[PDB]
Amino acid sequence: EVQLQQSGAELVRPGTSVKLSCKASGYSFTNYWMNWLRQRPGQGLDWIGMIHPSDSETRLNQKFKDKATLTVDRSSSTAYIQLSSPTSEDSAVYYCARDDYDGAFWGQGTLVTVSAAKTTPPSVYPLAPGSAAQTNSMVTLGCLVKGYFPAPVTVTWNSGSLSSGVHTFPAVLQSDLYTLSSSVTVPSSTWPSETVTCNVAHPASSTKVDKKIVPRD
Amino acid sequence: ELVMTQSPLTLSVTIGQPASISCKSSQSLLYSNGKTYLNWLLQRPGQSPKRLIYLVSKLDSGDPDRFTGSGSGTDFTLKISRVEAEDLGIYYCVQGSHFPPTFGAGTKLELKRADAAPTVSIFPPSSEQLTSGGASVVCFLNNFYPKDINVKWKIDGSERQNGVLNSWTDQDSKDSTYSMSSTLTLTKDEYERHNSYTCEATHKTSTSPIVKSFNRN
């Protein structure tokens, strides 16, 4: 068959560098060009460049002229790319691919995160109703899970009891740090009478904390 | 450079029903030989892009004849005779006649359903957060449809946008509605210099702005 296996998620401290690899197998590595694409968070796809493993001839998208350097290692049929002095603007999922007549095959991609940030447990803040008395019958509370790094974080309400009527929004990486929120809805008869708490974990910090959502004064 | 305008950005399909996506190029892809280089890829959530059609209308290996590419020069279309669950995702358009090769923003398939107004809840900063010097106001606009919504934070009087971060959940697979979190972040003094905080949404279900605000009192 055919396959393009890429290296594991890499963390890159801004202003330094990284080198990702794509292991070719199941075909004559040096017979076709090797493409390298990028896909920033939420964005579409950017074609970085391509290199031919036969003679290392490279052809680069001029936008990455000074950021990407493409190389190949015939012996182990691996193709490499090296990001030179990457910014946060370079955080994304990098792919290698062969898209030609003899077939189009893509690697599983490599996540790259550029951030000076170090392991950081999140600040868990309770989102309690301001003063919208009842609103109706149902009530929604929330938990602001702010400032952690790296990702991800697990958020559950009342240790798993509460599952329906919950929305844990995708984390947004802003200014070196990840921030995310989660909401929950329950009948006005259950809260504040009972006790709603979000239990959020952050594996990288070996942390897991609970935040009782107290009725606002 | 060469620009690929795909559309619509998000297509609402109905399982079993047909679908049509459009992709135009800022210039002709009709090359000097006979080949007009234009392919479509399909990225199913969490997967790597998978080329489906190459050279305007040639299907790839194991491609249900349900997908049909066609087009000429600058206008191209991808059609699906009857959308199946597995087709859902983002479809990409890519050209290779011009250099560098370029993609369209991608068209996202989404299951249609009935319009639903969003529920809105605004949350004042956590004292716990204040103590730390910061202050974020959170707004949740849950379970709404269609996905298209317009949110603005109005402080006391006017609109403002410094320190605003929004996040969107994928189309819920249970009800097929969308949810959006919106966080306005201020310093504690910045926050304390104002009284009124409003979360204003303009959705198609209401000819009137949907509001939920709170004063610091």
How does this structure look, described?
- The complex is a heterodimer of chains A (217) and B (217).
- Chain A has 217 residues and is mainly β.
- Chain A contains no helices and 19 strands.
- In chain A, the strands form 4 sheets. In chain A, strands 2, 4, 5, 6, 9, 10 and 11 form a 7-stranded mixed sheet that branches. In chain A, strands 12, 13, 15, 16 and 17 form a 5-stranded antiparallel sheet that branches.
- The radius of gyration of chain A is 23 Å and the shape is elongated.
- Chain B has 217 residues and is mainly beta.
- Chain B folds into 2 domains: 1-113, Immunoglobulins (Immunoglobulin-like, Sandwich); 114-217, Immunoglobulins (Immunoglobulin-like).
- Helices cover 5% and strands 48% of the residues of chain B.
- In chain B, strands 2, 4, 5, 6, 9, 10 and 11 form a 7-stranded mixed sheet that branches. In chain B, strands 1-3-8-7 form a 4-stranded antiparallel sheet, with no helix packed on it. Chain B has a 4-stranded antiparallel sheet with strand order 12-13-17-16.
- In chain B, β9 and β10 (102-103) form a beta hairpin.
- Chain B is elongated, with a radius of gyration of 22 Å.
- The chains are: A mainly beta (217), B mainly beta (217).
- Chains A and B meet through β5, β9, β10, β12 and β13 of A and β5, β10, β12, β13 and β16 of B.
